[PDB]
Design a protein around this nucleic acid. Structure first.
Ligand SMILES: [Mg+2]
Ligand SMILES: [Mg+2]
Ligand SMILES: [Mg+2]
Ligand SMILES: [Mg+2]
Ligand SMILES: [Mg+2]
Ligand SMILES: [Mg+2]
Ligand SMILES: [Mg+2]
Ligand SMILES: [Mg+2]
Ligand SMILES: [Mg+2]
Ligand SMILES: [Mg+2]
Ligand SMILES: [Mg+2]
Ligand SMILES: [Mg+2]
Ligand SMILES: [Mg+2]
Ligand SMILES: [Mg+2]
Ligand SMILES: [Mg+2]
Ligand SMILES: [Mg+2]
Ligand SMILES: [Mg+2]
Ligand SMILES: [Mg+2]
Ligand SMILES: [Mg+2]
Ligand SMILES: [Mg+2]
Ligand SMILES: [Mg+2]
Ligand SMILES: [Mg+2]
Ligand SMILES: [Mg+2]
Ligand SMILES: [Mg+2]
Ligand SMILES: [Mg+2]
Ligand SMILES: [Mg+2]
Ligand SMILES: [Mg+2]
Ligand SMILES: [Mg+2]
Ligand SMILES: [Mg+2]
Ligand SMILES: [Mg+2]
Ligand SMILES: [Mg+2]
Ligand SMILES: [Mg+2]
Ligand SMILES: [Mg+2]
Ligand SMILES: [Mg+2]
Ligand SMILES: [Mg+2]
Ligand SMILES: [Mg+2]
Ligand SMILES: [Mg+2]
Ligand SMILES: [Mg+2]
Ligand SMILES: [Mg+2]
Ligand SMILES: [Mg+2]
Ligand SMILES: [Mg+2]
Ligand SMILES: [Mg+2]
Ligand SMILES: [Mg+2]
Ligand SMILES: [Mg+2]
Ligand SMILES: [Mg+2]
Ligand SMILES: [Mg+2]
Ligand SMILES: [Mg+2]
Ligand SMILES: [Mg+2]
Ligand SMILES: [Mg+2]
Ligand SMILES: [Mg+2]
Ligand SMILES: [Mg+2]
Ligand SMILES: [Mg+2]
Ligand SMILES: [Mg+2]
Ligand SMILES: [Mg+2]
Ligand SMILES: [Mg+2]
Ligand SMILES: [Mg+2]
Ligand SMILES: [Mg+2]
Ligand SMILES: [Mg+2]
Ligand SMILES: [Mg+2]
Ligand SMILES: [Mg+2]
Ligand SMILES: [Mg+2]
Ligand SMILES: [Mg+2]
Ligand SMILES: [Mg+2]
Ligand SMILES: [Mg+2]
Ligand SMILES: [Mg+2]
Ligand SMILES: [Mg+2]
Ligand SMILES: [Mg+2]
Ligand SMILES: [Mg+2]
Ligand SMILES: [Mg+2]
Ligand SMILES: [Mg+2]
Ligand SMILES: [Mg+2]
Ligand SMILES: [Mg+2]
Ligand SMILES: [Mg+2]
Ligand SMILES: [Mg+2]
Ligand SMILES: [Mg+2]
Ligand SMILES: [Mg+2]
Ligand SMILES: [Mg+2]
Ligand SMILES: [Mg+2]
Ligand SMILES: [Mg+2]
Ligand SMILES: [Mg+2]
Ligand SMILES: [Mg+2]
Ligand SMILES: [Mg+2]
Ligand SMILES: [Mg+2]
Ligand SMILES: [Mg+2]
Ligand SMILES: [Mg+2]
Ligand SMILES: [Mg+2]
Ligand SMILES: [Mg+2]
Ligand SMILES: [Mg+2]
Ligand SMILES: [Mg+2]
Ligand SMILES: [Mg+2]
Ligand SMILES: [Mg+2]
Ligand SMILES: [Mg+2]
Ligand SMILES: [Mg+2]
Ligand SMILES: [Mg+2]
Ligand SMILES: [Mg+2]
Ligand SMILES: [Mg+2]
Ligand SMILES: [Mg+2]
Ligand SMILES: [Mg+2]
Ligand SMILES: [Mg+2]
Ligand SMILES: [Mg+2]
Ligand SMILES: [Mg+2]
Ligand SMILES: [Mg+2]
Ligand SMILES: [Mg+2]
Ligand SMILES: [Mg+2]
Ligand SMILES: [Mg+2]
Ligand SMILES: [Mg+2]
Ligand SMILES: [Mg+2]
Ligand SMILES: [Mg+2]
Ligand SMILES: [Mg+2]
Ligand SMILES: [Mg+2]
Ligand SMILES: [Mg+2]
Ligand SMILES: [Mg+2]
Ligand SMILES: [Mg+2]
Ligand SMILES: [Mg+2]
Ligand SMILES: [Mg+2]
Ligand SMILES: [Mg+2]
Ligand SMILES: [Mg+2]
Ligand SMILES: [Mg+2]
Ligand SMILES: [Mg+2]
Ligand SMILES: [Mg+2]
Ligand SMILES: [Mg+2]
Ligand SMILES: [Mg+2]
Ligand SMILES: [Mg+2]
Ligand SMILES: [Mg+2]
Ligand SMILES: [Mg+2]
Ligand SMILES: [Mg+2]
Ligand SMILES: [Mg+2]
Ligand SMILES: [Mg+2]
Ligand SMILES: [Mg+2]
Ligand SMILES: [Mg+2]
Ligand SMILES: [Mg+2]
Ligand SMILES: [Mg+2]
Ligand SMILES: [Mg+2]
Ligand SMILES: [Mg+2]
Ligand SMILES: [Mg+2]
Ligand SMILES: [Mg+2]
Ligand SMILES: [Mg+2]
Ligand SMILES: [Mg+2]
Ligand SMILES: [Mg+2]
Ligand SMILES: [Mg+2]
Ligand SMILES: [Mg+2]
Ligand SMILES: [Mg+2]
Ligand SMILES: [Mg+2]
Ligand SMILES: [Mg+2]
Ligand SMILES: [Mg+2]
Ligand SMILES: [Mg+2]
Ligand SMILES: [Mg+2]
Ligand SMILES: [Mg+2]
Ligand SMILES: [Mg+2]
Ligand SMILES: [Mg+2]
Ligand SMILES: [Mg+2]
Ligand SMILES: [Mg+2]
Ligand SMILES: [Mg+2]
Ligand SMILES: [Mg+2]
Ligand SMILES: [Mg+2]
Ligand SMILES: [Mg+2]
Ligand SMILES: [Mg+2]
Ligand SMILES: [Mg+2]
Ligand SMILES: [Mg+2]
Ligand SMILES: [Mg+2]
Ligand SMILES: [Mg+2]
Ligand SMILES: [Mg+2]
Ligand SMILES: [Mg+2]
Ligand SMILES: [Mg+2]
Ligand SMILES: [Mg+2]
Ligand SMILES: [Mg+2]
Lengths: 64, 115, 200, 143
RNA sequence: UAGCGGCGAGCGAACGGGGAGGAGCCCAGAGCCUGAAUCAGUGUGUGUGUUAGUGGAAGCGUCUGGAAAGGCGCGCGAUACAGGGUGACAGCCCCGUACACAAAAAUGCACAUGCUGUGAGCUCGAUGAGUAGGGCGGGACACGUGGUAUCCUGUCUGAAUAUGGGGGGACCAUCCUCCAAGGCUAAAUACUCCUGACUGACCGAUAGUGAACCAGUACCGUGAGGGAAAGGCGAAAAGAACCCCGGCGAGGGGAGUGAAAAAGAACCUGAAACCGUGUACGUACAAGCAGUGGGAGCAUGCUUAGGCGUGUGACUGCGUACCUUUUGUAUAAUGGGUCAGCGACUUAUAUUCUGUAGCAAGGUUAACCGAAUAGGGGAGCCGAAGGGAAACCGAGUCUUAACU
């Protein structure tokens, strides 16, 4: 049979042109008044997945 | 394709049992025991090729040290005396001369005396 | 061009079909694949599930001074198991159109070098009889052959069943293994024209 | 070439790792899977994205976005594969027959992928700024 | 994939497309006119097919051997060199095989068509109420009540009835589309207890069915149920008449058969463990993984008028088995009485990476038609373009009011 995509991972990552994955940052859902604006600004944009945990993403979704 | 393996195994066992030919008890006639003895024999064989060279040197040196003290010189002085007179002759031959040609050997000790 | 043995006519056949470098790997792969396609692969042993018997423990786990056993059917036991029992499987393997054509082009070109390819004009026995076909090959100086024809004559077909070393196949139905296997290849002028168009 | 004389290309085949066949094989006894542990066992190893009970990366990061439905029924046509239809008329049904875009694609767009030669009148189709410069420089008038 | 999902584990569509196969009708009823389409039988026609079958080609001589099909040398049939048998491997010795013919009788088919028996086609009328829908509780839909359409309903209710209603995924309105609440319908599709024929990069007696053999037997169990072991003399029984020892025995030894009887029925081959008989050397003052390097003697072979090989191994330096598990094992930690046989990284489909072969901005087909490993069939897939949550823009675009 075909491989089943880890759906949870499909909705949190997205494959860029080179091969790596973009993801949204943590710590930007609730408890924000105590957080400084500089944090909340830096956490707003999408960010690339690190080298260490790339293989864990690549396995979770083999069809990109 | 099924591979019945009765022909190959027997030839493997029979090859090793032939190497164990001579040993006492089960060692000669029982593969499972033989195989250990045959390996150990190899282990000891690899070792004693190194010891052959050590033992024979000791054996020669003993003969030279025996034959020198007949003529009144200790082995330690004899060899130093030969090396000061720059004689390249080894222990193997010195020991063989010391046994066979005594009249010859005497001249080597008389040469070692000079230095 | 390709000369004949009873005319000496210049059949101008294409360059890249009958005159290309012999690629060994491609041919090997295609003939191996053709062999692999011939297999039916109908065979089955029975796994420890499929063996007849009970799932009862022959003796209890502990207490008895014996090696813990779970069933009679386990492959370490006698009379049942075969750990990795094979099932009826399809051994046929895919070959690419361009690779199959490339391989035919490759082998069929090498027959021109080795002179196994004996191209001819009309080749057909008088009546459906083996005795005539057997006698007429002695004049042609042949024995083990693949007589490829465009217009497949029943006369010629029936006359070559019982002959072992002769095989009559239609120009449409040429194979990689056959062109390699047989010692000479007798092609009809129409068959060359058909195969030329087929392989292209 | 005879049926025996054939051989594969050097580098084609590579045997295969046969585990559990003596010391001389290299791998053999614990066939390349070490001593003990979950990974060594038959049916061993953990599932995908399992970091030993720690919250996995695909759960500790927030999900985002939504899958667009309009994005499924739109194509990105190359400027290279433009003049491959019917002289120089590329609406949608014409382009669809040429097998450049799928059947269920209503909207579509022509982008600057390079190279035009013939004059092609691109009707009933969205077209890019750089493509509009090229297609008109070739000859064909858009819309 | 879209979705569903302690949005975890996991589950997983439809639209649209390519194929195989194609076929539609009856009722909730009134006119003239009526056996004419239709089938459902009794049938009638060939063609059969099937359950018995018939014919069916052409080789000899030497050599080896127990025996010829073998070798060697010359023939001949072949729409028959599939295959099995025959004293070793047979185109031509036999049974078959290809090919041409068959059925008194029973039957399973496909068309004429006499027909107890059935209604044409055709205007009109009809169009399925405790129903659809709703509340409550469950279930089925990929869809876990979720914003949940759709269908099935246990329960309580309740329309319009074709200016009517259903649906188009909360819902509403416009458009489009269908017509529920009654029925019957072949083919493509699934299966093989069973009957043939044929084929295996299937097994060859610890395998293959549990079962090659009087096996679902012996035996075990109150019973449900479990469940074995056990193949081969030889070409042909020519299976050893007859003597001898012994208990008018078992068992042997001669004779005789046969190519052979260590092929004599406990019967092809006959390994190992294990147990003997005889020959050579060593062995009753000598300590230990029993070997290993050194090495006298003694016993045997060869050719030479001197040296080697083989067996043995007095004496002597070194030397604590193997596996496992371990920081670490001679360990007094694990496992093995020994031998023989069997016994463990596989198979299928998806996926990424390495090598290799093809073709190259292209590559490539899937099912399927195919007498078929060709050739069609590019439905699709993947690539050549990305950014963005998305509309959207695109060699740029996102971010932002805007970007040096
Ligand atoms: Mg938020
Ligand atoms: Mg602050
Ligand atoms: Mg790293
Ligand atoms: Mg995909
Ligand atoms: Mg063999
Ligand atoms: Mg043995
Ligand atoms: Mg060997
Ligand atoms: Mg021995
Ligand atoms: Mg000895
Ligand atoms: Mg022996
Ligand atoms: Mg030394
Ligand atoms: Mg040294
Ligand atoms: Mg090449
Ligand atoms: Mg059970
Ligand atoms: Mg139970
Ligand atoms: Mg015990
Ligand atoms: Mg079995
Ligand atoms: Mg394979
Ligand atoms: Mg394969
Ligand atoms: Mg041949
Ligand atoms: Mg034949
Ligand atoms: Mg051949
Ligand atoms: Mg063609
Ligand atoms: Mg073509
Ligand atoms: Mg190469
Ligand atoms: Mg290699
Ligand atoms: Mg393998
Ligand atoms: Mg492997
Ligand atoms: Mg390796
Ligand atoms: Mg290693
Ligand atoms: Mg490893
Ligand atoms: Mg270890
Ligand atoms: Mg272990
Ligand atoms: Mg450990
Ligand atoms: Mg490990
Ligand atoms: Mg694994
Ligand atoms: Mg891993
Ligand atoms: Mg397409
Ligand atoms: Mg389910
Ligand atoms: Mg499914
Ligand atoms: Mg589906
Ligand atoms: Mg279709
Ligand atoms: Mg169709
Ligand atoms: Mg369809
Ligand atoms: Mg039709
Ligand atoms: Mg029709
Ligand atoms: Mg009849
Ligand atoms: Mg008849
Ligand atoms: Mg006959
Ligand atoms: Mg004769
Ligand atoms: Mg004779
Ligand atoms: Mg004779
Ligand atoms: Mg004779
Ligand atoms: Mg005789
Ligand atoms: Mg003869
Ligand atoms: Mg002959
Ligand atoms: Mg021969
Ligand atoms: Mg035969
Ligand atoms: Mg036979
Ligand atoms: Mg014989
Ligand atoms: Mg025979
Ligand atoms: Mg032969
Ligand atoms: Mg022969
Ligand atoms: Mg013959
Ligand atoms: Mg035969
Ligand atoms: Mg012959
Ligand atoms: Mg017949
Ligand atoms: Mg008849
Ligand atoms: Mg008949
Ligand atoms: Mg008749
Ligand atoms: Mg009759
Ligand atoms: Mg009659
Ligand atoms: Mg009658
Ligand atoms: Mg009758
Ligand atoms: Mg009958
Ligand atoms: Mg019928
Ligand atoms: Mg409804
Ligand atoms: Mg209802
Ligand atoms: Mg509702
Ligand atoms: Mg309420
Ligand atoms: Mg409800
Ligand atoms: Mg449900
Ligand atoms: Mg459900
Ligand atoms: Mg379900
Ligand atoms: Mg939801
Ligand atoms: Mg909500
Ligand atoms: Mg609705
Ligand atoms: Mg509802
Ligand atoms: Mg639905
Ligand atoms: Mg109801
Ligand atoms: Mg009431
Ligand atoms: Mg009412
Ligand atoms: Mg009301
Ligand atoms: Mg109306
Ligand atoms: Mg109407
Ligand atoms: Mg209305
Ligand atoms: Mg409506
Ligand atoms: Mg809607
Ligand atoms: Mg829908
Ligand atoms: Mg729907
Ligand atoms: Mg209104
Ligand atoms: Mg309305
Ligand atoms: Mg209706
Ligand atoms: Mg109705
Ligand atoms: Mg009813
Ligand atoms: Mg209906
Ligand atoms: Mg059909
Ligand atoms: Mg076999
Ligand atoms: Mg058996
Ligand atoms: Mg047996
Ligand atoms: Mg046997
Ligand atoms: Mg059983
Ligand atoms: Mg059994
Ligand atoms: Mg009983
Ligand atoms: Mg027999
Ligand atoms: Mg026997
Ligand atoms: Mg007798
Ligand atoms: Mg008597
Ligand atoms: Mg008596
Ligand atoms: Mg008595
Ligand atoms: Mg008597
Ligand atoms: Mg008597
Ligand atoms: Mg008697
Ligand atoms: Mg007797
Ligand atoms: Mg007797
Ligand atoms: Mg006799
Ligand atoms: Mg005789
Ligand atoms: Mg004789
Ligand atoms: Mg004998
Ligand atoms: Mg005898
Ligand atoms: Mg006897
Ligand atoms: Mg007897
Ligand atoms: Mg016996
Ligand atoms: Mg025999
Ligand atoms: Mg025997
Ligand atoms: Mg023996
Ligand atoms: Mg003594
Ligand atoms: Mg003594
Ligand atoms: Mg002692
Ligand atoms: Mg000793
Ligand atoms: Mg020695
Ligand atoms: Mg010596
Ligand atoms: Mg002697
Ligand atoms: Mg020698
Ligand atoms: Mg003595
Ligand atoms: Mg010591
Ligand atoms: Mg342990
Ligand atoms: Mg410990
Ligand atoms: Mg130690
Ligand atoms: Mg110990
Ligand atoms: Mg121990
Ligand atoms: Mg321990
Ligand atoms: Mg322990
Ligand atoms: Mg152990
Ligand atoms: Mg033990
Ligand atoms: Mg594996
Ligand atoms: Mg690559
Ligand atoms: Mg090309
Ligand atoms: Mg190239
Ligand atoms: Mg057909
Ligand atoms: Mg096409
Ligand atoms: Mg790919
Ligand atoms: Mg694409
Ligand atoms: Mg490019
Ligand atoms: Mg894009
Ligand atoms: Mg903005």
């Amino acid at each position: 049979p075909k491989i089943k995509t880890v759906r949870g991972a499909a909705k949190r990552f997205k494959k860029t042109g080179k091969g790596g994955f973009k993801h949204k940052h943590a710590n930007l859902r609730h408890i924000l008044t105590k957080k400084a604006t500089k944090r909340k600004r830096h956490l707003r944009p999408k960010a690339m997945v690190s080298k260490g945990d790339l293989g864990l993403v690549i396995a979770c979704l083999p069809y990109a | 394709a099924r591979v019945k393996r009765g022909v190959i195994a027997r030839a493997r066992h029979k090859k090793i049992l032939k190497q164990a030919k001579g040993y006492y008890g089960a060692r000669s006639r029982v593969y499972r025991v033989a195989f250990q003895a045959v390996i150990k024999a190899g282990q000891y064989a690899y070792r004693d090729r190194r010891q052959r060279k050590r033992q024979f040197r000791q054996l020669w040196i003993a003969r030279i040290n025996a034959a020198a003290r007949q003529n009144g010189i200790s082995y330690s002085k004899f060899i130093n005396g030969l090396k000061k007179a720059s004689v390249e002759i080894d222990r193997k031959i010195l020991a063989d001369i010391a046994v066979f040609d005594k009249v010859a050997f005497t001249a080597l000790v008389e040469k070692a005396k000079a230095a | 061009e390709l000369v004949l043995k009873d005319a000496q006519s210049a059949l101008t056949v294409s360059e890249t079909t009958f005159g290309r470098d012999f690629n060994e790997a491609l041919v090997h792969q295609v003939v191996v694949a053709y062999a692999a396609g011939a297999r039916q692969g109908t065979r089955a042993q029975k796994t420890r599930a499929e063996v007849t018997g009970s799932g009862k423990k022959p003796w209890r786990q502990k207490g008895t001074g014996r090696a813990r056993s779970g069933s009679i059917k386990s492959p370490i036991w006698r009379s049942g198991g075969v750990t990795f029992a094979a099932r009826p499987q399809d051994h046929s393997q895919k070959v690419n159109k361009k690779m199959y054509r490339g391989a035919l082009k490759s082998i069929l070109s090498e027959l021109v070098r080795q002179d196994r390819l004996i191209v001819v004009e009309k080749f057909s026995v008088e009546a459906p009889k083996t005795k005539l076909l057997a006698q007429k090959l002695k004049d042609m100086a042949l024995e083990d052959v693949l007589i490829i024809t465009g217009e497949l004559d029943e006369n010629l077909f029936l006359a070559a069943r019982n002959l072992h070393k002769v095989d009559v196949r239609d120009a449409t139905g040429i194979d990689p293994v056959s062109l390699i296997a047989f010692d000479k290849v007798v092609m009809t002028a129409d068959a060359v024209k058909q195969v030329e168009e087929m392989l292209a | 070439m005879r049926l025996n004389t054939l051989s594969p290309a050097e580098g084609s085949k590579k045997a295969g790792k046969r585990l559990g066949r003596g010391i001389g094989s290299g791998l053999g006894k614990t066939g390349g899977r070490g001593h003990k542990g979950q990974k060594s066992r038959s049916g061993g190893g953990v599932r995908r994205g399992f970091e030993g009970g720690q919250m996995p990366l695909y759960r500790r990061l927030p999900k985002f976005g939504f899958t667009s439905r309009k994005a499924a029924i739109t194509a990105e046509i190359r400027l290279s594969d433009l003049a491959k239809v019917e002289g120089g008329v590329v609406d949608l049904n014409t382009l669809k027959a040429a097998n450049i875009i799928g059947i269920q694609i209503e909207f579509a767009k022509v982008i600057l992928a390079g190279e035009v030669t013939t004059p092609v009148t691109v009707r009933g189709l969205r077209v890019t700024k750089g493509a509009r410069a090229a297609i008109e420089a070739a000859g064909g008038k858009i819309e």
